[PDB]
Amino acid sequence: QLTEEQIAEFKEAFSLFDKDGDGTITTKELGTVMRSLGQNPTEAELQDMINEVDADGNGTIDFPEFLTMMARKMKDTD
């Protein structure tokens, strides 16, 4: 169940990528965090990953659609 606290927990993960705090994670933010994760995805890889979550087709992920992806995987306890 999406509790109030969980919404805040998701925010912590969002701000981890959104460095400047614009509210939208671009390929630059993603690439920076990905490198610290021990990986090195190319431009094409980064953009493709964005398109996976972006159901609008704007080339950027915001908090609302970010929640949708998280909830979609959290609603599965199997």
């Binding site: 927990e9 912590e12 993960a13 981890l16 959290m74």
Partner: peptide
């Protein structure tokens, strides 16, 4: 900080 690591995996 563990939770953040888990949430990061869900982002992959």
């Amino acid at each position: 900080n563990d939770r953040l690591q888990e949430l990061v995996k869900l982002f992959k």
